[PDB]
Design a protein around this ligand. Structure first.
Ligand SMILES: Nc1ncnc2c1ncn2[C@H]1C[C@H](O)[C@@H](COP(=O)(O)O)O1
Length: 674
């Protein structure tokens, strides 16, 4: 058993009635002086090191050639200037195991933490040395953390693409299904998560072909996708689609392997009309989509279900099956208890505050349920015919660290620089053989700036997650993020002289987006929270009015700007609590070969133990209230894990989900039971 693991294990051995939290500091110190520092490669100087890495195909030559070597030296100097030390074994372990560049044989380490940051910053700044130094400071102070794909691969030659999220529409044909599978594997190889909308695919019995897929409906397509992934995959289906019960039964524990889907995540899209039909206890119907396309010349999930539902029911050329809508909502709650699946998207909560309904309404979401954008189906054809390209979704992500941003008083600076980094990654992306995704990147230019360390920050300032004080902080914080995000998007539009495709018809352009911001104040109501924002200018209704006019004049470069991802791996590197979620465990036990490892939550001690309250003991109604408060100021979505007990009944699970719906929650993610 290595010394660093032994020292890490001594945290759980009590001393004077307390956990030995400081033993983690010894553990990480041992990890460096007994392992990491013995496996790093020596170089005489920075010039030799960089020439070696370029010439041996580790780094790309072009992004470095934009700087003079003297300027590169100064950027690297900036990274090593602040004496960065990991506070825990796991934070250091997660960087050097998952992110640090290794030699090709993978026996030595070629990058310190400061080297990766220096290279990522030199990639972002595109020759601008002074901006590269700001990126280094932003990342070394841990104010901003680029997503895994960007942070891992930026500046490297042997790599995937830097984009995290891909969402694909799939039209109703074998050529389309075949192309969607091909594109999914291509994009998954590039390092991104891939989510597929299956709501336009024809239901069971509508496929009259002698192929293995035919007779199972969309489950056949789910199987092909699931097998291919053996980046991860997801599939979404509208609740009014006939195959909804078969779609759900892929995640049953008792389901046989010919129907079962193990790797692929699943999501269900629920409009209000289904919630209306659940409220009044009467039987409802699910539709065979190809019959709807035959009749109306439009896909089911493109048409307005509030208006057309009764018309689909009364039309005899539209085929249907009767269901009990309350019992399907019960089934959803039950599967989420057993499996964690499916994810739920409350479609009208997404679309009632969506800025770009004129392009399209939002029909589905991504692998982690936070990306929420317009899309349009493509039509892929054979050799001698022409493809008709629609609009898929791509979004590259990054996260603010709330703790460090507040302590450095740098909300404006970090949001605007992060937005610039996300914009450069979007500009330098080059997707081949997926023109609907290429269209998304070039024309829509969406980015996904999120945040982590909410609970960690609140807990270390004596603010409980469920308190009105916490919601007061979140309200003001994310308002500010949205303000400076929009401002920078509009500034970039002025500088570049470009806007996102069909900006002119958006709620940003009409002014409607800003209505609540020009009329209501979002500064902190509690004095304790107002003192935390001391030194930072909190935008007022008057600033918002001025921003509204600025946007009306110059437009906006980005179609979407903000979304809060789960941050599973990167949160360790940041010594941060995951996302805006409440923590699961005060101390995480995990396996390490034969031995165990222990990770106390970042900033956990005996004197703040109360404030690091475990998510399972919280009231999920009050957790809903927190995320709803954040969702006000996020144009896309928030990955909302729900934390449950086996004591809860199906009745209790339905009441939580229906309350989430009532408060305007856009999506809910994996359902976690203790
Ligand atoms: N916690 C932590 N994070 C990062 N790097 C670390 C850490 N502990 C030790 N080291 C590395 C940094 C130096 O190269 C050397 C001496 O660190 P010194 O601080 O002089 O003991 O070990």
């Amino acid at each position: 058993v290595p010394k660093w693991i032994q020292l890490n294990n001594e945290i759980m051995i009590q001393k004077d009635g307390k956990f030995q939290f400081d033993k983690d500091k010894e553990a990480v110190h041992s990890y460096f002086v007994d392992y990491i520092n013995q496996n790093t490669v020596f170089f005489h100087n920075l010039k030799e090191k960089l020439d070696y890495l370029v010439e041996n195909q580790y780094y790309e030559e072009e992004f470095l050639s934009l700087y003079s070597f003297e300027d590169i030296k100064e950027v690297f100097k900036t990274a090593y200037a602040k004496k960065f030390r990991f506070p825990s074994f796991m934070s250091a372990f997660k960087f050097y195991n998952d992110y640090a560049l290794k030699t090709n044989d993978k026996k030595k380490i070629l990058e310190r933490y400061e080297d990766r940051i220096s290279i990522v910053a030199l990639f972002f700044a595109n020759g601008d040395t002074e901006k590269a130094k700001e990126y280094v400071n932003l990342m070394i102070n841990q104010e901003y953390q680029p997503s895994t794909p960007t942070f891992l691969n930026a500046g490297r030659k042997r790599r995937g693409e830097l984009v995290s999220c891909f969402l694909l529409e799939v039209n109703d044909s074998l050529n389309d299904i075949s192309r969607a599978i091909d594109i999914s594997m291509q994009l998954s190889k590039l390092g991104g998560g891939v989510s597929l909308n299956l709501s336009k695919l024809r239901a069971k019995g509508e496929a009259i072909k002698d192929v293995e897929n035919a007779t199972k409906g969309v489950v056949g397509v789910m199987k092909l996708l699931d097998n291919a992934f053996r980046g991860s995959g997801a599939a979404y289906l509208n609740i009014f689609h006939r195959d909804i019960n078969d779609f759900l039964d892929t995640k049953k524990i008792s389901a046989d392997e010919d129907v079962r889907v193990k790797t692929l995540s699943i999501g269900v899209v629920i409009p209000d009309k289904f919630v209306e039909l659940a409220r009044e206890d009467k039987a409802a119907y699910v539709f065979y989509p190809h019959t709807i396309y035959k009749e109306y010349g439009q896909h089911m999930d493109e048409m307005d279900m509030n208006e057309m539902y009764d018309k689909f029911v009364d039309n005899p050329r539209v085929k249907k099956e009767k269901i009990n809508p309350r019992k399907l909502l019960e089934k959803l709650a039950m599967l989420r208890s057993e499996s964690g699946y499916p994810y739920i998207m409350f479609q009208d909560n997404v679309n009632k505050v969506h800025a770009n309904n004129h392009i399209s309404k939002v029909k589905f979401s991504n692998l982690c349920s936070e990306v929420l954008q317009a899309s349009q189906v493509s039509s892929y054809t054979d050799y001698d015919e022409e493809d008709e390209i629609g609009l898929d979704i791509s979004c590259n992500l990054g996260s603010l660290n709330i703790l460090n941003v507040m302590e450095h008083k740098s909300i404006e600076k970090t949001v605007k620089l992060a937005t610039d980094s996300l914009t450069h990654v979007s500009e330098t992306t080059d997707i081949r053989n997926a023109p609907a995704v290429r269209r998304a990147n070039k024309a829509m230019k969406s980015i996904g700036l999120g945040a982590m360390n909410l609970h960690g920050y609140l807990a270390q300032n004596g603010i409980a997650y469920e308190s009105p004080e916490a919601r007061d902080f979140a309200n003001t914080f994310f308002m500010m993020v949205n303000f400076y995000s929009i401002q920078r998007s509009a500034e970039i539009a002025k500088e570049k002289g470009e806007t996102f495709d069909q900006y002119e018809g958006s709620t940003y352009a009409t002014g409607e987006y800003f209505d609540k911001y020009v009329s209501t104040d979002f500064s902190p109501k509690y004095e304790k929270i107002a003192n935390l924002f001391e030194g930072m200018h909190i935008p007022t209704t008057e600033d918002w009015k001025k921003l509204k006019a600025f946007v009306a004049e110059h437009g906006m470069y980005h179609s979407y700007r903000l979304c809060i991802a789960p941050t599973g791996s990167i949160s360790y590197v940041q010594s941060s609590t995951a996302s805006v979620m409440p923590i699961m465990e005060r101390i995480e036990e995990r396996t390490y070969g034969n031995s165990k490892t222990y990770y106390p939550m970042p900033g956990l001690a005996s004197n703040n133990w109360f404030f690091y309250k475990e998510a399972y003991d919280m009231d999920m109604f009050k957790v809903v209230d927190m995320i709803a408060t954040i969702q006000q100021h996020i144009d896309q979505g928030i990955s909302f894990t729900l934390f449950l007990k086996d004591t809860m009944t199906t009745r209790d699970l339905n009441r939580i989900d229906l309350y989430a719906h009532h408060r305007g929650i856009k999506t809910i993610y994996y359902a976690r039971t203790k």
